[PDB]
Design a binder for this molecule. Sequence first.
Ligand SMILES: Nc1ncnc2c1ncn2[C@@H]1O[C@H](COP(=O)(O)OP(=O)(O)O)[C@@H](O)[C@H]1O
Ligand SMILES: Nc1ncnc2c1ncn2[C@@H]1O[C@H](COP(=O)(O)OP(=O)(O)O)[C@@H](O)[C@H]1O
Ligand SMILES: [Mg+2]
Ligand SMILES: [Mg+2]
Ligand SMILES: [Mg+2]
Lengths: 518, 41, 77, 122
Amino acid sequence: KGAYQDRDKPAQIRFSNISAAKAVADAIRTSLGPKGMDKMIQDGKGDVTITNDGATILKQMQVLHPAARMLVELSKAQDIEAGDGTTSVVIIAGSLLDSCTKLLQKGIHPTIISESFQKALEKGIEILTDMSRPVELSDRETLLNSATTSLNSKVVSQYSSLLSPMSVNAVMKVIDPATATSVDLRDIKIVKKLGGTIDDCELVEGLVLTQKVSNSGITRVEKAKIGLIQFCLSAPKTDMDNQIVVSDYAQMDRVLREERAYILNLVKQIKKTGCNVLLIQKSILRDALSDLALHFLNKMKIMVIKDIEREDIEFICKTIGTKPVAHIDQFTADMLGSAELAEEVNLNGSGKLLKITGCASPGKTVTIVVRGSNKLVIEEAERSIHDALCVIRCLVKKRALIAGGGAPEIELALRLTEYSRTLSGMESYCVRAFADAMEVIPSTLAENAGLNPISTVTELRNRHAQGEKTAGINVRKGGISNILEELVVQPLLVSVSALTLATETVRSILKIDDVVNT
Amino acid sequence: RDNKQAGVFEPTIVKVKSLKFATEAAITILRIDDLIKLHPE
Amino acid sequence: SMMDVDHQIAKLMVELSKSQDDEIGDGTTGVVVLAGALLEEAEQLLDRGIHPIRIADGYEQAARVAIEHLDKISDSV
Amino acid sequence: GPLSVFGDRSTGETIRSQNVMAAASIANIVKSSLGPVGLDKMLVDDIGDVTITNDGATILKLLEVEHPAAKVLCELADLQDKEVGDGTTSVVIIAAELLKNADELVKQKIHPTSVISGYRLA
Ligand SMILES: Nc1ncnc2c1ncn2[C@@H]1O[C@H](COP(=O)(O)OP(=O)(O)O)[C@@H](O)[C@H]1O
Ligand SMILES: Nc1ncnc2c1ncn2[C@@H]1O[C@H](COP(=O)(O)OP(=O)(O)O)[C@@H](O)[C@H]1O
Ligand SMILES: [Mg+2]
Ligand SMILES: [Mg+2]
Ligand SMILES: [Mg+2]
């Protein structure tokens, strides 16, 4: 007889947290895998969202239980570190906690569970790395297969043939493949435009803008010289309080005339450089493009796009080699960008786009125009393309590849069962729980595919024990097979990060024993 | 009736776009297997 | 019996304990604990995807085995 | 219960049947306005403002639709009107019928991914 444990609220809190986490996991289990389906979410305001993304689903369903909130943060962290696996990570976390339930019931301490889970995590990282194979960024087929695998789960999977090569080109265009250790997906601009179908999505090497052209009649420009203007083409205005006091009738005519002359001198200094396309930054506190200035620019045959945003400036410069000019004195020819074409293209009466294509200095930037028949399908196409880009980013970070179809989860389950049998004690039960908990992703893949989960997972375990460690659930044949023949591959980083973040979140939730209402 | 000789003509784009858009809509709606409708605030 | 239950499965568990008391007069807490444990294990089996009727049939099989094993290890007074 | 979300949750055949019902509602609104023998509709805007029309896009724009799976078909008619200018009724009718038959298959437990692949191929 040890310590009576006079208090039961810590255990009640542990069980409540575990129940909430398992509820979240069991709620999103259906959105896992190629045979997984989407969820519609109508916000309180009425904003509808169809999605297959775990992070999106959890962020959009206003979860209230603390443990469920923590799983939301977990999925967001997975979205940050890998951008793919935001459903697998939540399912793994929920399963680890659901196993902690019976462990606690057996009478093991949460600290022992936490430490044994850390042990299982380290052994599992070892196991996954052993399973992994290195990858060369030159392996375009491997990159295409990673992207296709990432897209198989989403509504845009019949369009994988189109959106995987784009998702590989974009990333391979915005990084130096020899030196790159990561990727900034802000180099990849995505432009959602209603209309057409998802088969109309496009990869624009140049620049795309939603801002409208101000000139009428000048919509297309070949051999385009482009200038960024951070100053205002309007009557002069000092930053101090300025007035123009008239005391004679002549000064009125003089005021109008001198304003005309100021504006004309500005537009002439612009024309003299050879500029035929003019991007004007957005200007509050002063008119950036007066009607006089527009008149003169149009007469001088210059396309004008104003209302450019102060956050798109670095992107536009990175793209078309322009240099932003804030004083007319510094507006010269070396501060321009040469583009083989600049056109305002129409999209079947569904809007207009300014496309600056062709560039003498196309610097590590690309744009993806996402088309679609509905706002919902466009939004989910954007999310899926982001997942594919993030998979390529994981591949760039860690040059290692792992098979899919639940092969890593089954191999993990098996080898950690062996590890548990070797680490006899009370850690043995916890490590065996960790193993059988991770054996839940294959079960989910099977259930969603429409197979018998028990038989499928037993066959998978048996073949992995025989030695087929690259064996998984072939939803095309309907059973088990070598999953590399179906070309289901994913970056090792995804599985590794999922495991790490799930184990840390589980340990955090296990270190909790009370809830207060501040 | 022979509608080509009767003069009942439609631009090909009508039927083509109808089919494509209807298919896109059907796929989007069929992809839904769950619905979470949040209580307004 | 004194418990003011509203849930119908909890009412079934009250009936279970009452039945043990009627037939035997002892075990009224063991029956409830054991039934709760069986359902708690069926929970994981359903998570793995087994049909609840298959679970019930496996439970019947194991229950027959356990009953015969009790007759086997029993003693007499 | 276990899920603590502050809202309602439909799942499975329930929500699939609901989506098909909504789409069917939208299509049955406009079916009567199809072809040389179709007839027009009055629409009263809660103030006595009257609108006569046979244009399915116009009808579905004027209606106040509450279901998102029906808003999808309304936007479909709008998109057909933007990109073509004709077919706004036929496209809605066809989308709803595809939804109906595809949900019948999903009830027969053909996987929706398989229905979607077959629809794309067709
Ligand atoms: N064609 C396929 N066959 C078998 N498994 C697949 C296939 N495509 C993806 N998967 C598996 O589906 C899981 C990821 O699916 P997904 O729904 O995107 O979840 P997550 O958000 O966790 O990536 C991974 O285990 C991956 O290996
Ligand atoms: N003279 C005709 N005889 C038979 N069918 C016709 C005739 N004119 C039109 N249709 C058919 O009517 C259908 C729909 O017409 P309508 O409702 O006016 O436009 P939409 O449905 O394209 O918005 C089309 O399938 C068209 O082929
Ligand atoms: Mg994925
Ligand atoms: Mg007793
Ligand atoms: Mg017509």
